[PDB]
Amino acid sequence: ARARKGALVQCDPSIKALILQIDAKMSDIVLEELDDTHLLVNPSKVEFVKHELNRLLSKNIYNPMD
Amino acid sequence: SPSLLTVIIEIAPKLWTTFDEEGNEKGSIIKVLEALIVFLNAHLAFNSANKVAVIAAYSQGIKYLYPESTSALXXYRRFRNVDETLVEEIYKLFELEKKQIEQNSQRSTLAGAMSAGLTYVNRISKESVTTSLKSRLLVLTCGSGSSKDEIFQYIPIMNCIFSATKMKCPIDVVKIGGSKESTFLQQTTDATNGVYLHVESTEGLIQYLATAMFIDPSLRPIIVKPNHGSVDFRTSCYLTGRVVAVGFICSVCLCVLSIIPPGNKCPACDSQFDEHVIAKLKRK
Amino acid sequence: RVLRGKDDYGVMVLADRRFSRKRSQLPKWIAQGLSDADLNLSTDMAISNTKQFLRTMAQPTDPKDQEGVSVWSYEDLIKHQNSRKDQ
Amino acid sequence: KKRTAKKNITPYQRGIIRSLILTLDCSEAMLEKDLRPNRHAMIIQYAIDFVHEFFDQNPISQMGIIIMRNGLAQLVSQVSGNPQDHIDALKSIRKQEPKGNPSLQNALEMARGLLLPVPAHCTREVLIVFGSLSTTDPGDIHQTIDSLVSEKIRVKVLGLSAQVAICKELCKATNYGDESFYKILLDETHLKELFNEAVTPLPVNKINKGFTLVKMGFPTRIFEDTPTFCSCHSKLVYGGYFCPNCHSKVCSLPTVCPCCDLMLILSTHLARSYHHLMPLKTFAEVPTTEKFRSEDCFSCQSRFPXXXXXXXXXXXXXSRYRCEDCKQEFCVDCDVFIHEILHNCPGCESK
Amino acid sequence: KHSVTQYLEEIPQQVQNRLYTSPATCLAIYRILPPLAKFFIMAMVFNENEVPLLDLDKWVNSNGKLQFQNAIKSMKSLHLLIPNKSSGTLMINLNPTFKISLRNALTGGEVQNSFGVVVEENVVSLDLLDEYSANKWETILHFMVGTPLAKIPSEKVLNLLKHSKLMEEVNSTGEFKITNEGFQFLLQEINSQLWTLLLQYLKMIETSKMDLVDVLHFIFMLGALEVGKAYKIDALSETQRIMLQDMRDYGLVFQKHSNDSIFYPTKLALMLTSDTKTIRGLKNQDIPDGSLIVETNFKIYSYSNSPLQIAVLSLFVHLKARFVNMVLGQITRESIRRALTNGITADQIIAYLETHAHPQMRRLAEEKLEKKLELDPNCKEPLQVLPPTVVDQIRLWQLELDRVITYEGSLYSDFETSQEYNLLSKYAQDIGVLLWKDDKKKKFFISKEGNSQVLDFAKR
Amino acid sequence: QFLQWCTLQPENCAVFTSDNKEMFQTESGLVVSTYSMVANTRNRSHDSQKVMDFLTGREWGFIILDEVHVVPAAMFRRVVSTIAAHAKLGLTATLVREDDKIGDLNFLIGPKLYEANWMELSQKGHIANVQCAEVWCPMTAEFYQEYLRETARKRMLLYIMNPTKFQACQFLIQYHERRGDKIIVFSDNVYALQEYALKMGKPFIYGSTPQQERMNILQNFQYNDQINTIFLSKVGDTSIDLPEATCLIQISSHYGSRRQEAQRLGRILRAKRRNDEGFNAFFYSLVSKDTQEMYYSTKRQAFLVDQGYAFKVITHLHGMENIPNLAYASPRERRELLQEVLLK
Numbered sequence A: 001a002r003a004r005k006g007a008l009v010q011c012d013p014s015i016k017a018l019i020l021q022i023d024a025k026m027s028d029i030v031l032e033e034l035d036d037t038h039l040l041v042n043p044s045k046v047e048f049v050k051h052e053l054n055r056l057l058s059k060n061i062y063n064p065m066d
Numbered sequence B: 001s002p003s004l005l006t007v008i009i010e011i012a013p014k015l016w017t018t019f020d021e022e023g024n025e026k027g028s029i030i031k032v033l034e035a036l037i038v039f040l041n042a043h044l045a046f047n048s049a050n051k052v053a054v055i056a057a058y059s060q061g062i063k064y065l066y067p068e069s070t071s072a073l074x075x076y077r078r079f080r081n082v083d084e085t086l087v088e089e090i091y092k093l094f095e096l097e098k099k100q101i102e103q104n105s106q107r108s109t110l111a112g113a114m115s116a117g118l119t120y121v122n123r124i125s126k127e128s129v130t131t132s133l134k135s136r137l138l139v140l141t142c143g144s145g146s147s148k149d150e151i152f153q154y155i156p157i158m159n160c161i162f163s164a165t166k167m168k169c170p171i172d173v174v175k176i177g178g179s180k181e182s183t184f185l186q187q188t189t190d191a192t193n194g195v196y197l198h199v200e201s202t203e204g205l206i207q208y209l210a211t212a213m214f215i216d217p218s219l220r221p222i223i224v225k226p227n228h229g230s231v232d233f234r235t236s237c238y239l240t241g242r243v244v245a246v247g248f249i250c251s252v253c254l255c256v257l258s259i260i261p262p263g264n265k266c267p268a269c270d271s272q273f274d275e276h277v278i279a280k281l282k283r284k
Numbered sequence C: 001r002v003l004r005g006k007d008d009y010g011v012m013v014l015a016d017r018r019f020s021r022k023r024s025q026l027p028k029w030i031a032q033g034l035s036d037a038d039l040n041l042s043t044d045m046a047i048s049n050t051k052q053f054l055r056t057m058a059q060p061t062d063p064k065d066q067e068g069v070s071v072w073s074y075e076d077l078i079k080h081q082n083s084r085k086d087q
Numbered sequence D: 001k002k003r004t005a006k007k008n009i010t011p012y013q014r015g016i017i018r019s020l021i022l023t024l025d026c027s028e029a030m031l032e033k034d035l036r037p038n039r040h041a042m043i044i045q046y047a048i049d050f051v052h053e054f055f056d057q058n059p060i061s062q063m064g065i066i067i068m069r070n071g072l073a074q075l076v077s078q079v080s081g082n083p084q085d086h087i088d089a090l091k092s093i094r095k096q097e098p099k100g101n102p103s104l105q106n107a108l109e110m111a112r113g114l115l116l117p118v119p120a121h122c123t124r125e126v127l128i129v130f131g132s133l134s135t136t137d138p139g140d141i142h143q144t145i146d147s148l149v150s151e152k153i154r155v156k157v158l159g160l161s162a163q164v165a166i167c168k169e170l171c172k173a174t175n176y177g178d179e180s181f182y183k184i185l186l187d188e189t190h191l192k193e194l195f196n197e198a199v200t201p202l203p204v205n206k207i208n209k210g211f212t213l214v215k216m217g218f219p220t221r222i223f224e225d226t227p228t229f230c231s232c233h234s235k236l237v238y239g240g241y242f243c244p245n246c247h248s249k250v251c252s253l254p255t256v257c258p259c260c261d262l263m264l265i266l267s268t269h270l271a272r273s274y275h276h277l278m279p280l281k282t283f284a285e286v287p288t289t290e291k292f293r294s295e296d297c298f299s300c301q302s303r304f305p306x307x308x309x310x311x312x313x314x315x316x317x318x319s320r321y322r323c324e325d326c327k328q329e330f331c332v333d334c335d336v337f338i339h340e341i342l343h344n345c346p347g348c349e350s351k
Numbered sequence E: 001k002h003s004v005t006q007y008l009e010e011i012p013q014q015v016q017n018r019l020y021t022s023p024a025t026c027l028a029i030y031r032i033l034p035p036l037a038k039f040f041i042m043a044m045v046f047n048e049n050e051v052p053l054l055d056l057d058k059w060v061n062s063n064g065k066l067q068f069q070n071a072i073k074s075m076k077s078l079h080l081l082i083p084n085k086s087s088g089t090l091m092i093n094l095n096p097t098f099k100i101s102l103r104n105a106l107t108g109g110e111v112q113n114s115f116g117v118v119v120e121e122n123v124v125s126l127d128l129l130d131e132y133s134a135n136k137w138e139t140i141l142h143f144m145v146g147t148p149l150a151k152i153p154s155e156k157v158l159n160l161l162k163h164s165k166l167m168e169e170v171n172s173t174g175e176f177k178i179t180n181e182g183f184q185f186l187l188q189e190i191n192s193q194l195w196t197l198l199l200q201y202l203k204m205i206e207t208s209k210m211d212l213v214d215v216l217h218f219i220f221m222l223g224a225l226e227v228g229k230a231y232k233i234d235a236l237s238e239t240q241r242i243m244l245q246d247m248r249d250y251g252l253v254f255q256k257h258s259n260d261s262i263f264y265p266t267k268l269a270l271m272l273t274s275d276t277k278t279i280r281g282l283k284n285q286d287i288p289d290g291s292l293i294v295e296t297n298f299k300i301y302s303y304s305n306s307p308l309q310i311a312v313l314s315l316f317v318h319l320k321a322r323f324v325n326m327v328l329g330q331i332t333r334e335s336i337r338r339a340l341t342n343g344i345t346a347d348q349i350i351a352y353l354e355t356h357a358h359p360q361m362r363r364l365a366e367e368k369l370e371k372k373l374e375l376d377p378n379c380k381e382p383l384q385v386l387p388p389t390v391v392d393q394i395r396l397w398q399l400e401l402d403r404v405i406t407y408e409g410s411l412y413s414d415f416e417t418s419q420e421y422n423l424l425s426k427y428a429q430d431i432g433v434l435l436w437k438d439d440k441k442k443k444f445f446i447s448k449e450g451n452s453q454v455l456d457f458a459k460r
Numbered sequence F: 001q002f003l004q005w006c007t008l009q010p011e012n013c014a015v016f017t018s019d020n021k022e023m024f025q026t027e028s029g030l031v032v033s034t035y036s037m038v039a040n041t042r043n044r045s046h047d048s049q050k051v052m053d054f055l056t057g058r059e060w061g062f063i064i065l066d067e068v069h070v071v072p073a074a075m076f077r078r079v080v081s082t083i084a085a086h087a088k089l090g091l092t093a094t095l096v097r098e099d100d101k102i103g104d105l106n107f108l109i110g111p112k113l114y115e116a117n118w119m120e121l122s123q124k125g126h127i128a129n130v131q132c133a134e135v136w137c138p139m140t141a142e143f144y145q146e147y148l149r150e151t152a153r154k155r156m157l158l159y160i161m162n163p164t165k166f167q168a169c170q171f172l173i174q175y176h177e178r179r180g181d182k183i184i185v186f187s188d189n190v191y192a193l194q195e196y197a198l199k200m201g202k203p204f205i206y207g208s209t210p211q212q213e214r215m216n217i218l219q220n221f222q223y224n225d226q227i228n229t230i231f232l233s234k235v236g237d238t239s240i241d242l243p244e245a246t247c248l249i250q251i252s253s254h255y256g257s258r259r260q261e262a263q264r265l266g267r268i269l270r271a272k273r274r275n276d277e278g279f280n281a282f283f284y285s286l287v288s289k290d291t292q293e294m295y296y297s298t299k300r301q302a303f304l305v306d307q308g309y310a311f312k313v314i315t316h317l318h319g320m321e322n323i324p325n326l327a328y329a330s331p332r333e334r335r336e337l338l339q340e341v342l343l344k
């Protein structure tokens, strides 16, 4: 019985890349990257990936809303 | 699946006598009664507050026991009331036991009790459209003698199978008594997806009752545990009284005759047959 | 002419503006059937009216006791009722 | 106020054996907009229901199915005691759309010859659900009706919301002069009840025909399932039946044996004929002020019976619809239900 | 829903068996197990012997065996049984405390915590003492989610909500607002909400003087049956009575007046588990007294109303001018954006609208239902049940407020040949267990239902 | 475009401009003249007056009027100052008009018989089925980085250019070419449209298309199915003799005000005497999802459903990446074309 658990993050390669850019930004918590459309991460830190993803987008977007 | 388990039990004080007669009087229906009291609480408990009910048959009539028709105008405390109201109603049936009850032993109102129940279930499924109750019933009989095959109750047995098959009802039967596979019941338990257990007299049926009579309620994925084969070589030649195989069936009467037929007016309806048709049947 | 007996039916439509004012000029038994709301109809609600008519008429509405009123059953509802009517 | 029948003039013979062959209309007129999807689609819904009903109360019978497209009638399910063949045949048809005209002369012509193999004891029957208003006859139709009435093939047809004299005539002609058989709906439920009523045998006043003694035997289920084997389908069936005379494994069916050819029945089919043949007497609605019986029902225990004097509510009616031969009360529910599923009059059974 | 069942297995084996000490709590834990698990309990409750798994495996035939794995896995996690690698085989037997406490409570046994109720003149009327309890819920719910008047006076309750973060409202500022947890409070209706709060108080009231078995015995005593007389007086522990009185104050004990009487067995204790009918100065127009408006035009047509309810409706729609029957409000992508600002996903609101606002949307839902499920294989086009047009806008709005995705399961390996992966994948779509796959990688991150069955088929 | 399909023989109907002298006072049958003629400062040859002299001279029973509101009522009040016919006919086009003076033109022609309740009548079977759709072109970092950098409206072509948007268009092109259908595209860009028309490579109507080439492509478009894609810029409205609509695509969505968007929707979606396709009037709107006009793309959707046109969204394209000419498909070239379009 083999079963390798984790946090499978599947998205577009670009957000993946961004998430991976973001994931590289807090110390490579992505355990594995299954393909261009999937990522395997430790759930302990995915929370903060989005937080900085949020901040960096909040730093980036800043929401003009024209 | 709230399943309505309604038990129908027949008590002729001549047949409960036979339950006393068989073996020794090592325990009358009370062992079966205390078995049933425990069994009724369990299925009541099993599915989602799934209701129960009880009817009986006198020697000379029938009556409801747990449904407890309008009269005024522990363990979960619903087991208690279901048991005790049943215990009180049935003891009221035993005071309705005397010589005149002992009198009308010619008939067995088993036929009437079970037709009345189908009116009751059609009545509850009609009302309980919400929470459609995956109901299913039960039969317990004290196998008594003096009538090897009382054949006066055959058509209502078979008609109600259709309604039972028509209303899609699995039907389980347990016979307590002498080893007489009630062929018509044996076909019946077979006909409408049921389980036949011809248990012996004095065994606490609780082990038996829980095993094979809980099969259906809504489940039916599990091997029914019926008794042996359910042969459908049906009623004896009405004229002969021998079970026919190549039956000889009269006419619009549809009476079953053996190789016996009188050649005229088959012995269930006044229908003369074409002597040519009789001779054609005799061309062999 | 489209009608023969009391069991007969059929539509007798009138198609002209002047028919609105000549409803009285029609014979009584025709006039009894021509009601006020049936005047000057456009062709459209004419078809809906006869549509329901043909359907309802197509039904076997035979009470056989209201026909005791309108058929005056055999030699009796005349002899019973009308020989009472000699008043 | 009551809508109940006076008297039945036919409990004596019912056509217990049948060969009913239902024919449909897949023509343009079925695409008009009166019935909810159309004529075409909602007609087919109730036919499926009737199909299930027709074989439940006359399972000894068979049926075939024919459509009516493009002035050409087209058989879609053979005359069979197997409803699923017809049911599956009906499932495909609704997916095609009705077209062309109903050429009744076509449809009548193939119906008449389809029933020639149907024997004397089996009854020939045709049920036309006509919904268009014009036909297209390949030949003389009176020739065919004359040929039809000659073959002892009664015809009852269910016109849509209209009356057509020829099917007035056809139902009149075939059904022994007794025109009772062009009954027509105004309504879906009227259509629904038009379907349910076509299930039972159809006696009006039977003429004296050869009452033929019918020789058959009864099959018995097989046990060995690893020995899954069949003589009626040549496949691995985990247990079938065995004809009493042929001795060949036959799958579960009231169908005839396929090796010695005797009708295979267990017991269940004939008892539907019994309550078909000898039904009960209708539960009389007891008079309101003259009943004075138990304030309950009999088949069930329905304490609702009145309210004891309520000016209007009590002077209305006392829910005591009681059968006669038993003289036992029955709530309308039971009285309706007793008369609905289990004939088996509860009072008349216990005595 | 936190699925409180997962909490019972989380408490270690002993406190379960400690919990299992009262045949009440034996008889209680039994009703939540999956029906396969239920069936495997009672068999080996009475026949006083363990059973090999091969029989339990042969008892369950093909598909439905997944519930056979559903049964046995929940069974072991809460340790009401003891697996036994006795001779290399599997000897299955109850945690015996369960079976006999059950068997006792089955055959009139010693569940005195179960028998802790008392029967007396049950003066609690059907209408009496639960309107306070129902109003208790109404007032505190208006307090917790934020009503026009937040009449929730449960100081112990308010601390649990803020301390447990039950609502994403500023407890420091007194805010009772719906956060991610507060949005989840708006989702779990009766069980799940009744589940969710029972968890917060246990987390809150767990530091000192817990007595969890007594807490669980006392909680299961008040909700097990109407303790009636002697419940809050006698059939209650010290911390249990404080819990019972605290449950009394929270309404979950409809503890009768005088603060010292039998367990006021409010109906609130019943609903936490019953998962059945939910309906609870001197006027209360019901049941359809509530009302709302949700139709294809995406607008509120309110004729019936309820203030906390329309306050709740206003939590995701603008209110402009409450009229005689209508409240001036119109649901838009802006209106739901009031909740998406709170991170409230357009997921629970889906189930909310299909259930809630129905008392005015009965016909509207009923006309939407049309019974288009048996007609579904017949008429392949379902007739707008349930409304799909709203959810796509919600999803597209949710998709507009989105772009983070993740999956559960476990990555799998040792798939040696293409035939087994092709055969395993083919069967997986038959039961529907595979999130994403690829023959190239021979890896996928899904549930283990695929791995358990191939092992069981290979091994037995 | 209709009156010869109509029963009318134009031999009688003297068309008048007073640059267009025609047979006044001898015109035997019905007449078709125009306002600026019939009264204006554009009362500009005595053909005009003499027609009007004839208009007064001959007694007229009925007056068919088309868009009286645009031209001042005063001249209509002057074609209502002089002649005294018997009837007029106000076939008005808007509920509220600048000729809604307190004495309305309703109370001079005949009462209202036909109004904003266009549900009784057109539903009786006149109009066919029109399908509308709105594809969400997938997001790519630069557009957002382009969205991020400027909040200005200059993002307009920056999501219009989406090469993925070109792709979905080409799918319809091969699709409607496969179906023998006809495609209208509403693209006011010049470069990215050329960039796209270059990317497609069919004889293409585009920005400032030669009307003959327009007509040539149109002839090669409606009668010839080989060219089954034309691009109508803002020069279509207003106005050309707009071509038939089976597959309308709209790229630009500012095109304000919204009263025009009712116009364009009505104007660009012309009628089609083809029933081979199940939705014989496709309306499409290729929008880069997650861009500036999601607000304004959501503004178009509410308009159409108010107009009642059958509408849908197709973002799960069948073979989205399977189409030919995946030019600029990559986010880089979308970025590269985004740099290409930042010029525009």
Ligand SMILES: [Zn+2]
Pocket (backbone or CB within 6 Å): B250, B251, B252, B253, B254, B255, B266, B267, B268, B269, B270, B271
């Ligand atoms: Zn006979």
Ligand SMILES: [Zn+2]
Pocket (backbone or CB within 6 Å): D230, D231, D232, D233, D234, D237, D240, D250, D251
């Ligand atoms: Zn076979």
Ligand SMILES: [Zn+2]
Pocket (backbone or CB within 6 Å): D242, D243, D244, D245, D246, D247, D248, D257, D258, D259, D260, D261, D262
């Ligand atoms: Zn045979």
Ligand SMILES: [Zn+2]
Pocket (backbone or CB within 6 Å): D297, D298, D299, D300, D301, D302, D330, D331, D332, D333, D334, D335
């Ligand atoms: Zn009754």
Ligand SMILES: [Zn+2]
Pocket (backbone or CB within 6 Å): D323, D324, D325, D326, D327, D328, D345, D346, D347, D348
């Ligand atoms: Zn009777």
